Amino acid sequence: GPMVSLAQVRGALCGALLGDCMGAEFEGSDAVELPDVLEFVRLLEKEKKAGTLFYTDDTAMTRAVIQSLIAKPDFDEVDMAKRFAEEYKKEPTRGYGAGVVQVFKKLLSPKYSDVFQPAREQFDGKGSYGNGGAMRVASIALAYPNIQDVIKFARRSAQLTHASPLGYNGAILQALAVHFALQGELKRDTFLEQLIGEMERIEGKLPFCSRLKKIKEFLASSNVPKADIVDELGHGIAALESVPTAIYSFLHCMESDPDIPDLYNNLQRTIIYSISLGGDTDTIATMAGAIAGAYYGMDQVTPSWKRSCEAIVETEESAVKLYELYCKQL
Ligand SMILES: Nc1ncnc2c1ncn2[C@@H]1O[C@H](COP(=O)(O)OP(=O)(O)OC[C@H]2O[C@H](O)[C@H](O)[C@@H]2O)[C@@H](O)[C@H]1O
Ligand SMILES: [Mg+2]
């Protein structure tokens, strides 16, 4: 349908920033109540001062990825690794995982010449199964039209910290989700078909595909409890329990949720619903918000919501530069 607009590249970046900043406020609290979320959102819209919400590691790594792609459009993983590690070093308290810290320490030492190696040594050679690969990967889909490029650069961006296939395939799936959200206004069943299609290839036991199948099920039900969603899809720091959950959040909120006032637009709905799931609300909201931002575009990123976020202005700016990458690759 559409060729991809700047509105959609902005959409996706602001969506992710929103999901980070807002979901951070409920993170690690795993009983979250939708009433608390709505109450927070109302308070947010009335805030007199701007920039009251600070972003976390999710956004910090995101901006590193973007500065790398801008600087090295061809994709330079050494450059990207350098940016990750210096970002960590500049702002180490933004919320990073306890494991991934050790990667940044290693990459910052003279001791390593292979940038993938520290990630390979995580957890006894098995590598991290965490969602930190996925939480930052969106920009790959915004910079690279060609799905092949999206897959291999998602893998490789992720592999700088997440050496387990659980870790890097989560990053691929989340980057795919954004890719297809972008390519016109796809229908729910087509969107899933695409994702199952690509992940059956990439994976083939079949963890992500089975979660993705589980998702197909849930969208054929109506009034699915949050318990059931959390039970099957998860709401965890593990990529396997967050990426599919974020994807489900996005698809669900294409339609009305009886419990969320219809005066909230689709992207708002998506963020509110993500946070209501609890767990790692931060990373799930940032991922779902990126998919939703790519799909509905900037028009659903409301002035009252976005003015609350740290670095909103810089985010909007960076999207123009991402957009130019995208346009170059066509
Ligand atoms: N293979 C493994 N073996 C044992 N434990 C693991 C393994 N993989 C992960 N863990 C556990 O997973 C934890 C995180 O793995 P990390 O690779 O540090 O971090 P991230 O970048 O994925 O970020 C994950 C979230 O954390 C932040 O809030 C971010 O904002 C994300 O929301 C470890 O400390 C382990 O207990
Ligand atoms: Mg975080």
UniProtKB/Swiss-Prot annotation:
Outcome of swapping residue 282 to N: Complete loss of activity
Coiled-coil regions listed in the entry: none
Effect annotated for changing residue 58 to N: Complete loss of activity
Record-listed E.C. numbers: 3.5.1.-, 3.2.1.143, 3.2.2.-
One example GO MF annotation: ADP-ribosylserine hydrolase activity
Activity: how regulated: The protein undergoes a dramatic conformational switch from closed to open states upon substrate-binding, which enables specific substrate recognition for the 1''-O-linkage. The glutamate flap (Glu-27) blocks substrate entrance to Mg(2+) in the unliganded closed state. In presence of substrate, Glu-27 is ejected from the active site: this closed-to-open transition significantly widens the substrate-binding channel and precisely positions the scissile 1''-O-linkage for cleavage while securing tightly 2'- and 3'-hydroxyls of ADP-ribose. Activity is inhibited by calcium.
Binding annotation for Mg(2+) 1: 20, 56-58, 282
Site (Glutamate flap): 27
UniProt record similarity statement: Belongs to the ADP-ribosylglycohydrolase family.
Protein name: ADP-ribosylhydrolase ARH3
UniProt organism field: Latimeria chalumnae
